[PDB]
Amino acid sequence: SMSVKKPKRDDSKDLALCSMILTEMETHEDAWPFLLPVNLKLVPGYKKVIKKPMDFSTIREKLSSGQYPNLETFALDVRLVFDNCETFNEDDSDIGRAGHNMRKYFEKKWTDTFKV
Ligand SMILES: Cn1cc(C(=O)NCCN2CCCC2)ccc1=O
C-alpha cells in the first residue's frame, strides 16, 4: 500500500532475456507457420475468426520498439500466437502440431529463464 513497498524482482535483464527466447523461437524448425502474419487475403476465414492476430515478427517489432511494458505482456503475445493456432488448425495438421510443439518449447524456456 501507500509507502509500504513489497520487494520486487530485478527486472533489468528482462528485455535481453525475452529477446534471446524470441530468437530461439524464430530459429526453431517448427517456427515456419508463425514467422510472418497470416495472409488475410489468402487464408479464408482467418480475418473473421481470429480477432487478435499475432506472429513472431510482430512480437519482434514490438520488442525492438518498447511496446511491451513488462515481461508478462510479452508472454501474453507469445501465447496468443499458439492460442490462435489451436483455434484455427486441427491438432494433428502440420501447422497445428507445430503450434503445440512451439508452445511447449516456449513454456519450458520461460520457466527455465525466469522461475529461477
Ligand atoms: C499460423 N497459421 C499460418 C498459416 C500459413 O499459411 N502460414 C504461411 C506458411 N507459409 C507457407 C510456406 C511457408 C510459410 C495458415 C493458418 C495459421 O493458423
Sequence spans of domains, the chain = 1-116
Please identify which residue in the block is written with the cell numbers 503445440: 100
Instruction: Round to whole Å and give the CA distance between 98 and 88.
Output: 13
Way the structure was solved: X-ray
* Cell numbers linked to 34: 508463425
Give the resolution to one decimal, in Å. Answer: 2.0
- 68: its cell numbers: 511491451
Ligand 1 and 89: CB distance under 6 A: yes
Question: Which three three-digit cell numbers place residue 15?
Answer: 528485455
- Rounded Cα distance between 56 and 84, Å, is 13
* CATH architecture observed for domain 1-116: Up-down Bundle (1.20)
CA dist 93 and 99 (Å) reads: 10
Of 102, 58, 100, nearest in space to 77 by CA: 58
Cα-Cα-Cα-Cα dihedral of 84, 89, 90, 94, to 10°? -110
* Sign of the torsion formed by the C-alpha atoms of 63, 9, 73 and 75: positive
Q: How far is the CA of 33 from the centre of ligand 1 (A)?
A: 4
Whether 38 lines ligand 1, by a CB cut-off of 6 Å, is: yes
State how far the Cα of 29 lies from the Cα of 35, in Å rounded to an integer. 11
> What is the rounded distance in angstroms from the CA atom of residue 113 to the CA atom of residue 29?
21
Q: Which helix (H) or strand (E) holds 74?
A: helix 71-88
Pocket test for ligand 1, best of 35, 89, 101 (most atoms within 8 A of CB): 89
Q: Is the Cβ atom of 33 under 6 angstroms away from ligand 1? A: yes
Nearest to 25 by CA among 77, 91, 84: 77
* Distance from residue 80's CA to the centre of ligand 1 (Å): 15
Task: Give dist(CA 23, CA 112) in Å, integer.
Answer: 16
